[PDB]
Amino acid sequence: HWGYGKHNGPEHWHKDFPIAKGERQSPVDIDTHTAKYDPSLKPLSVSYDQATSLRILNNGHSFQVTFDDSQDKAVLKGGPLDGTYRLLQFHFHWGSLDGQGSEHTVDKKKYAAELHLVHWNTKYGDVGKAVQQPDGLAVLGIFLKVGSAKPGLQKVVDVLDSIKTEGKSADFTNFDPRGLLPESLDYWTYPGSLTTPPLAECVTWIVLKEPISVSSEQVLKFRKLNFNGEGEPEELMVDNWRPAQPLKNRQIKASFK
């Protein structure tokens, strides 16, 4: 029922998911002058060399690449995190125009899109258990700006015509998510939530400061996807982002000076 339109979009979600008005909701605006450098944070450890992608799919709110998370292959550790978090999937949020599309903002600036690499804390055994814990998930967020192409994204872009509508999926093996990462792992971190229903407050957010550049042709392909399933009125999958939510009693920490 929920979506991103006038009658079912983010301002309506609280009726079915009252935690939408909770104390640690995401995304947020990152005020760069108020985020404090935390010298106690450790460097992130992004260990993706053994990642095993499985499928790419249109779920009616984004498109997602899924990974085999039945053992410790692709893992996120360090930074603000305690323990080992396994990569489950990545997906994107994007706009109808290059100025909008990210969920997090930086000094109120919106990027054209935002990549979310979703990981779960192995101490909880499965993702369903992890989403019920305040430290169950860690999402690595990466901003996309429009400029030069990202070569490591092209394999994704070229397969989107095969998953145009909700429900569609395709084999998507041997995709290397390291090709989506910027040079720097400098980041901001804060405790938050899933940005789509059920909006569970189970996420340690790690948002990289350095955006990746993608080309206009690449993001234009994102915007040809459909929210609807095959054989329904065509509603372009654009502006599938939740706006910034109140920071409330939280501090955003920076890994860098």
| Nearby residues of 68 by Cβ (< 8 Å), 6 or more positions away | 52, 53, 54
195: annotated binding-site residue?
Answer: yes
CB-CB contact of 237 with 170 (8 Å): no
> Binding mask 197-236 vs ligand C97 (x if CB under 6 A, - otherwise)?
-x-x------------------------------------
CB-CB contact of 195 with 26 (8 Å): yes
Binder of Zn ion out of 24, 104, 116, 209 (CB under 5 A)? 116
Residue 217's φ and ψ, nearest 5 degrees, are -65, -40
CB of 96 vs ligand C97, minimal distance in Å: 18
196: annotated binding-site residue?
Answer: yes
The binder of 198, among Zn ion, ligand C97, none, by C-beta within 5 to 8 A per type, is: ligand C97
**Residue with Cβ nearer ligand C97 (25 or 226):** 25
State how far the Cα of 179 lies from the Cα of 12, in Å rounded to an integer. Answer: 36
Q: What count of Cα atoms within 13 Å lies in the side-chain half-sphere of residue 141? A: 30
91: annotated binding-site residue?
Answer: yes
The footprint of ligand C97 on this chain (CB under 6 A) covers a number of residues equal to 11
Residue with tokens 């899109």: 113
> Binding mask 176-195 vs ligand C97 (x if CB under 6 A, - otherwise)?
------------------xx
Rule CB under 6 A: say whether 66 interacts with ligand C97: no
Chain mean position to CA 116: 2
State how far the Cα of 249 lies from the Cα of 73, in Å rounded to an integer. Answer: 35
Residues between 130 and 159 that touch ligand C97 (CB under 6 A): 131, 139
Q: Which residues are catalytic?
A: 61
Rule CB under 6 A: say whether 118 interacts with ligand C97: yes
116: annotated binding-site residue?
Answer: yes
Q: Helix (H, G, I), strand (E, B), or coil: what is residue 33?
A: coil
Rule CB under 6 A: say whether 19 interacts with ligand C97: no
The binder of 112, among Zn ion, ligand C97, none, by C-beta within 5 to 8 A per type, is: none
Give the ranges where the chain is alpha helix by DSSP (H).
Answer: 13-16, 127-130, 154-157, 216-222
State how far the Cα of 108 lies from the Cα of 2, in Å rounded to an integer. Answer: 26
As annotated, the binding site for substrate includes 195-196
Q: Which residues bind Zn ion (CB under 5 A)?
A: 116
Q: Which residues bind ligand C97 (CB under 6 A)?
A: 116, 118, 127-128, 131, 139, 194-196, 198, 200
